[PDB]
From Swiss-Prot, chain A:
Residues 20-70 are annotated as: Heptad repeat 1. The chain holds residues 901 to 1145 of 1273 of the full protein. Subunit of the fusion protein that is processed upon entry into the host cell. Mediates fusion of the virion and cellular membranes by functioning as a class I viral fusion protein. Contains a viral fusion peptide that is unmasked after S2 cleavage. This cleavage can occur at the cell membrane by host TMPRSS2 or during endocytosis by host CSTL. In either case, this triggers an extensive and irreversible conformational change that leads to fusion of the viral envelope with the cellular cytoplasmic membrane, releasing viral genomic RNA into the host cell cytoplasm. It comes from the Viruses. Changing residue 50 to N: In strain: Delta/B.1.617.2, Mu/B.1.621. This is Spike protein S2'. Residues 49-93 form a coiled coil. Disulfide bonds join 132-143, 182-226.
From Swiss-Prot, chain B:
The chain holds residues 704 to 1048 of 1273 of the full protein. This is Spike protein S2. Residues 113-129 are annotated as: Fusion peptide 1. Disulfide bonds join 35-57, 40-46, 132-137, 318-329. Glycans are attached at residues 6, 14, 98. Residues 235-279 form a coiled coil. Residues 127-141 are annotated as: Fusion peptide 2. The gene is S. Changing residue 1 to L: In strain: Omicron/BA.2.12.1.
C-alpha cells in the first residue's frame, strides 16, 4: 500500500522496497515525536480551547448582564415590585425587559456568527477527512507540508486532529543537466526523469530521487533532429537489441 | 453547434500561453471604538449614566479586537507561506522568459514590481492633534481609530518577491521541502508534462512560448493600466469600511426620541432628573448604533476571512504547485 | 475663518454638534474642538512575569500628549512607544505592536522593541544547466487541529428575563414572537452541531476492525490504534488530547458558574 502511495508522488516502488526498514523506523519515530510534542507543548490545542473559552465567556457575560439597570431604578425585579404599584412597576419592568431582551438578542446574534465559523471549519474538516484520510491528495499543503502520503484521524474534544504523513526530500546534490541527448542525428528525451551528469558521465534518473541509470532506448524517446533543441548534449544512447545480435 | 460524429475527432495543432488576473481581498481595516467618547464624549454625567448598562462596551471592544487580530492572521496565512526569503540571481538568463514586470524594481524607493506599483497606484485608501485642531478627523474625535496592520506593504512585497524567486528558480520543490534548482525551460517542460503534453513540444517551440509569455505579461500590464474598474473588489472593501465609519459618525445627529441630539444642550437646559431621561434615550440610541456597526463588521469580517482562506488555498495550490483542478487557477490547462 | 450670517449664533457639524460659536461681547467667530484625542495601548510581558509595562500612544509624533515621559522613547508608525528599548537586531514577533514593530522581554530584564524578521535569507544557486536532485528522504508526521462542533445551548426566556415573576411574564407577553425567534435560532445552531459532527466523523458506514496480529511490515500504529486495556477504548494520542482539553447537575447538588 505504501509502495502505491510512493508511486502516487512520483517515486518508483523499488525505492520503498529497498528501504522498507528505514521508512518504517522513520514513521515510528515521527509518531513518537508527535506524542512527545503534544504531551509537552501546552498551547498545541489552543484552537479547541478557544471555542470552549468563548462559549463559557458568552454564557457568563449573559449571566452578568442581569445586574444592569438599563435606565431603570434597579436591577432586581423583586425590589421594584415591593416598592411600587403596578403602574410604575410596569414602567421599570418594561425598561428591564427591553434591556434583557437586547442582551439575549446580542447573545443569539454572536452565537449565530460563531456557529457559521464553526460550520466552515467543520466543512473543511470533512473535506480533509474525505481527501487526506480516504485518499491520497495531489493538492499542495492541503494534507500537510511535503508530498502527501497518508493521513490518520484522531478524535479530540469538539474537534479532529489529523496526523499527516508526508514525504520530504533530503540531502540534495547538484548535477549538470541537459534538455536532450543527441546520439545519431536524432534528439532523445527522457520518458520519465531527467538527464544528469557528474561532469564526465551522463545518466537518466527519476526526478524526486537520485537513481542514475544508463541512457538506453527504453529510457528515452526520439523526436526530431539535433538542430532545434537549445542546449542539446552529445552522448551515446545504448541499444539493448545488439549485444545479443 | 459542435460537429459531433461517431468517428470524428478534433485535435489542436497549436497553442496559446494565456495570462489572466484574479483579484482576491485578504484583509480589511482594523478599527477600534472608544465607547465613552462616542456615546458620552467629554461628559461626566453621561459617563456615570452609561456605567449602569454593564459590559456591553467590553463586549463590543472584544468583538472589534477579535476582528483586528483576525485581519493580521489573514495576511499572515496568505503571504507568509515560506519562511526562507529567496532571492533571484543577478543574471536574468531564463531561456528567453522575461519576468521583469513581476520581479522587484531596485531603482524605486519601494522594492516593488511595475505591476505591483500600478496596482498600488490604482487603489486609493499619523494624524496628530496639532494638524487636526476631514472625515478621518471627525472619526477620530468620536472615539473611532484605525489601527495599522502588523505587516507593512514593504514586508508583503518582500514575501511576494521571495515566492516569485523560489518559483522561478526551483519550481514546485521549495513548497514541499528544500529548494532544488532547475533550469526554467526544464521546469516548464515538467509543467507541460503535468498537463499531458510531451516536453519536446516545449523544447521545439521554446522561443515561441517565451514570446507568447512575454507578450501576455505585457498585455496584462496594459489591461490593468487601462481598465479603471479592474480592482473593484479591494476598492469595494475600502469603500464599505469608510461608509460604515461615516454612517457611525453621522448617526450622532439623531435624537432617538429625545428632545435633542447634543449632550451639552440637554445638560444646559435641564436639571439632572429631567436631563437623565433624555441622556438615557441618547445612550440607548448610540448603543444601538454601535451594536449595529459591530454586527455588520463581524459579518463583513467573516466574508473577508472566507476570501482570505480562498486566497491562501490559491497561493498553496497555484503558486507553490501545479493544479489539476479545473478553473481553480485560471481558464485553460494550468 | 467661518463667516456667520447676522441672524446666526451657533454652527453645527455633520453630527449636529456645536463646533462654531459667536462670542457675544466681541463679535468674532470661534471654533470649538474636543480635547480628548488619540488611542492608548499597553504592552506587558505578563503581570506574573514582571511589573514594568510599555505604553503605545497612537496618533502621537515624538520626532507632548503623553501621560509620563521616560528614559527611552521610540517613534514607530503606530505611534510613540515609551518604556521599551529600541534594538537594531531583528527577531521573530513575540508581542505585535504594529507597522513591522514587535516587542519582547529580554535580559536587568527589560522590554525591547525591534523590527520583525520575515525569515532567514536564502539564495538558490540557479544556473541554466544545473539541477539539484535529492539523494535521500524523511518521513514526516505533522498535526492539524480543526474545530468541528461547539456546545449546544438552550435559553428559557421567561426564566432569564422574568424569573419566577408572574407580573413580568404578563408584561413579556406584550412583545410577541421574539423569544420564539431566539429559541428557533438556538435550536438551529444545536441541530447544526450534531450535523457537523456526523458529517466529519460518520463518513464510512462499516465499522472496520484491525486484525489481532499487528504485523504490518515493521510499521507500528500502536500510538493511534485503540488501547483495549483502558475503560475508554481510545488511542494513547487520543487519551492525551482528551486530557489536554478542559471542558446531570441535579437541584439537590446545586441548592458554581454552571449552577
Ligand atoms: C560519474 O559516473 C561515472 C560512471 O559511473 C563514474 O566513473 C566511475 O568511477 C569509479 C570510481 O571508483 C570507477 O570505479 C568506475 O569504473 C567508473 N565507471 C566507469 C569508468 O564507467 C565517475 O566517477 C562519476 N563522476 C564522479 C565525479 O564521481
Ligand atoms: C555534437 O556532435 C555533432 C556530430 O558529431 C557535431 O556536429 C559536427 O561538428 C563538426 C565540427 O563543428 C562539423 O564539422 C560537422 O559538420 C558537424 N556535423 C553535423 C552532422 O552537424 C557537433 O559539433 C557536436 N557538438 C559539440 C558541442 O561537440
Ligand atoms: C502557432 O501560433 C503562433 C502564434 O499565433 C504562430 O506564430 C506566428 O506565425 C506567424 C506566421 O509565421 C507570424 O507572422 C507571427 O509573428 C507568429 N507569432 C509569434 C508570436 O511568433 C505559429 O506560426 C503557429 N504555428 C502553426 C504551425 O500554426
Ligand atoms: C523584459 O521586458 C522589458 C519590457 O517589458 C524590457 O525593458 C525594455 O528594455 C529596452 C532595452 O533595454 C528599453 O528600451 C525599454 O525602455 C525597456 N522597457 C521597460 C518597460 O523597461 C527588458 O529589457 C526585457 N528583458 C530582457 C532581458 O530583455
Ligand atoms: C538517509 O537518511 C537516513 C536517516 O538519517 C540515514 O539513516 C541513518 O544513517 C546513519 C549512518 O548510517 C545511522 O547512524 C542512523 O542510525 C540512521 N538513521 C536511521 C533512522 O536509520 C541513511 O543513512 C541515509 N542514507 C543515505 C544514502 O544518505
Ligand atoms: C547557458 O549559458 C551559457 C552562457 O550564456 C551558454 O553558453 C549555454 O549555451 C547556455 N546553456 C543553455 C542550455 O541555455
Ligand atoms: C513625525 O514627525 C517627523 C518630523 O517632521 C516626521 O519626519 C515623521 O515622518 C513623522 N512620523 C510619522 C509617522 O508621520
Ligand atoms: C510500538 O511502539 C510501542 C512504543 O513505542 C512499543 O511498546 C510496541 O512494542 C511497538 N509495537 C511493536 C509491534 O513492536
Amino acid at each position: 500500500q505504501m509502495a502505491y502511495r510512493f508511486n502516487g508522488i512520483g517515486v518508483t516502488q523499488n525505492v520503498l522496497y529497498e528501504n522498507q526498514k528505514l521508512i518504517a523506523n522513520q514513521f515510528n519515530s515521527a509518531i513518537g515525536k508527535i506524542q512527545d510534542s503534544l504531551s509537552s507543548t501546552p498551547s498545541a490545542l489552543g484552537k479547541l480551547q478557544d471555542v470552549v473559552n468563548q462559549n463559557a465567556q458568552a454564557l457568563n457575560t449573559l449571566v452578568k448582564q442581569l445586574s444592569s439597570n438599563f435606565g431603570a431604578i434597579s436591577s432586581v425585579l423583586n425590589d421594584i415590585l415591593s416598592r411600587l404599584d403596578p403602574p410604575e412597576a410596569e414602567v421599570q419592568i418594561d425598561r428591564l425587559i427591553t434591556g434583557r431582551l437586547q442582551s439575549l438578542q446580542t447573545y443569539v446574534t454572536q452565537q449565530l456568527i460563531r456557529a457559521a465559523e464553526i460550520r466552515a471549519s467543520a466543512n473543511l474538516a470533512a473535506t480533509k477527512m474525505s481527501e487526506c484520510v480516504l485518499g491520497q491528495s495531489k493538492r499542495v499543503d492541503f494534507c500537510g507540508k511535503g508530498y502527501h502520503l497518508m493521513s490518520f484521524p484522531q478524535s479530540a474534544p469538539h474537534g479532529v486532529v489529523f496526523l499527516h504523513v508526508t514525504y520530504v526530500p533530503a540531502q540534495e546534490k547538484n548535477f549538470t543537466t541537459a534538455p536532450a541527448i543527441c546520439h545519431d542525428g536524432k534528439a532523445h528525451f527522457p520518458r520519465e526523469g531527467v538527464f544528469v551528469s557528474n561532469g564526465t558521465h551522463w545518466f537518466v534518473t527519476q526526478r524526486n530521487f537520485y537513481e542514475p541509470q544508463i541512457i538506453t532506448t527504453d529510457n528515452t524517446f526520439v523526436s526530431g533532429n539535433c538542430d532545434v533543441v537549445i542546449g542539446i548534449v552529445n552522448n551515446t544512447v545504448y541499444d539493448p537489441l545488439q549485444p545479443e545480435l | 453547434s459542435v460537429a459531433y460524429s461517431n468517428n470524428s475527432i478534433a485535435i489542436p495543432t497549436n497553442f496559446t500561453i494565456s495570462v489572466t488576473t484574479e483579484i482576491l481581498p485578504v484583509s480589511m481595516t482594523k478599527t477600534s471604538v472608544d465607547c465613552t467618547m462616542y456615546i458620552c464624549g467629554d461628559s461626566t454625567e453621561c459617563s456615570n449614566l452609561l456605567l449602569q448598562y454593564g459590559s456591553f462596551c467590553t463586549q463590543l471592544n472584544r468583538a472589534l479586537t477579535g476582528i483586528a487580530v483576525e485581519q493580521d492572521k489573514n495576511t499572515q496565512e496568505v503571504f507568509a507561506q515560506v519562511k526562507q526569503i529567496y532571492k533571484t540571481p543577478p543574471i536574468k538568463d531564463f531561456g528567453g522568459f522575461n519576468f521583469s514586470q513581476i520581479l522587484p524594481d531596485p531603482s524605486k524607493p519601494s522594492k516593488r514590481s511595475p505591476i505591483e506599483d500600478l496596482l498600488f497606484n490604482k487603489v486609493t485608501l499619523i494624524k496628530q492633534y496639532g494638524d487636526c485642531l476631514d472625515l478621518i478627523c471627525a472619526q477620530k474625535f468620536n472615539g473611532l481609530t484605525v489601527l495599522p496592520p502588523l505587516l507593512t506593504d514593504e514586508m508583503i512585497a518582500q514575501y511576494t518577491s521571495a515566492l516569485l524567486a523560489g518559483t522561478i528558480t526551483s519550481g514546485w520543490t521549495f513548497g514541499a521541502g528544500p529548494a532544488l534548482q532547475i533550469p526554467f525551460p526544464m521546469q516548464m517542460a515538467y509543467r507541460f508534462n503535468g498537463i499531458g503534453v510531451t516536453q519536446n513540444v516545449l523544447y521545439e517551440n521554446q522561443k515561441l512560448i517565451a514570446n507568447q509569455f512575454n507578450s501576455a505579461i505585457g498585455k496584462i500590464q496594459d489591461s490593468l493600466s487601462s481598465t479603471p474598474s479592474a480592482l473593484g473588489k479591494l476598492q469595494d472593501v475600502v469603500n464599505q469600511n469608510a461608509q460604515a465609519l461615516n454612517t457611525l459618525v453621522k448617526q450622532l445627529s439623531s435624537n432617538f426620541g429625545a428632545i435633542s441630539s447634543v449632550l451639552n444642550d440637554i445638560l444646559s437646559r435641564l436639571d439632572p432628573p429631567e436631563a437623565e431621561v433624555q441622556i438615557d434615550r441618547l445612550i440607548t440610541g448610540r448603543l444601538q448604533s454601535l451594536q449595529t456597526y459591530v454586527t455588520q463588521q463581524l459579518i463583513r469580517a467573516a466574508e473577508i476571512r472566507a476570501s482570505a482562506n480562498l486566497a491562501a488555498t490559491k497561493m498553496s495550490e497555484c503558486v507553490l504547485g501545479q493544479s489539476k483542478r479545473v478553473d481553480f487557477c485560471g481558464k485553460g490547462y494550468h | 475663518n467661518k463667516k456667520f450670517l447676522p441672524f446666526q449664533q451657533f454652527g453645527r457639524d455633520i453630527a449636529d454638534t456645536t463646533d462654531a460659536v459667536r462670542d457675544p461681547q466681541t463679535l468674532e467667530i470661534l471654533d470649538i474642538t474636543p480635547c480628548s484625542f488619540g488611542g492608548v495601548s499597553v504592552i506587558t510581558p505578563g503581570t506574573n512575569t514582571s511589573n514594568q509595562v510599555a505604553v503605545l500612544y497612537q496618533d502621537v509624533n515624538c520626532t507632548w500628549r503623553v501621560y509620563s515621559t521616560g528614559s527611552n522613547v521610540f517613534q514607530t508608525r503606530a505611534g510613540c512607544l515609551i518604556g521599551a528599548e529600541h534594538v537594531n537586531n531583528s527577531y521573530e514577533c513575540d508581542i505585535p505592536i504594529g507597522a513591522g514593530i514587535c516587542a519582547s522581554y529580554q535580559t536587568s530584564q527589560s522590554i525591547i522593541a525591534y523590527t520583525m524578521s520575515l525569515g532567514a535569507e536564502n539564495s538558490v544557486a540557479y544556473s541554466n544547466n544545473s539541477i539539484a536532485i535529492p539523494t535521500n528522504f524523511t518521513i514526516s508526521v505533522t498535526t492539524e487541529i480543526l474545530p468541528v462542533s461547539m456546545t449546544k445551548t438552550s435559553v428559557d426566556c421567561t426564566m432569564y428575563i422574568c424569573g419566577d415573576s408572574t407580573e413580568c411574564s404578563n408584561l413579556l407577553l406584550q412583545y410577541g414572537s421574539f423569544c420564539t425567534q431566539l429559541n428557533r435560532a438556538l435550536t438551529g445552531i444545536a441541530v447544526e452541531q450534531d450535523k457537523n459532527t456526523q458529517e466529519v466523523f460518520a463518513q464510512v458506514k462499516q465499522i472496520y476492525k484491525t486484525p489481532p496480529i499487528k504485523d504490518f511490515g515493521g510499521f507500528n500504529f500502536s500510538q493511534i490504534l485503540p488501547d483495549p486495556s483502558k475503560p475508554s477504548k481510545r488511542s494513547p494520542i487520543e487519551d492525551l488530547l482528551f486530557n489536554k482539553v478542559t471542558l446531570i447537575k441535579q437541584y439537590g447538588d446545586c441548592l458554581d458558574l454552571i449552577c
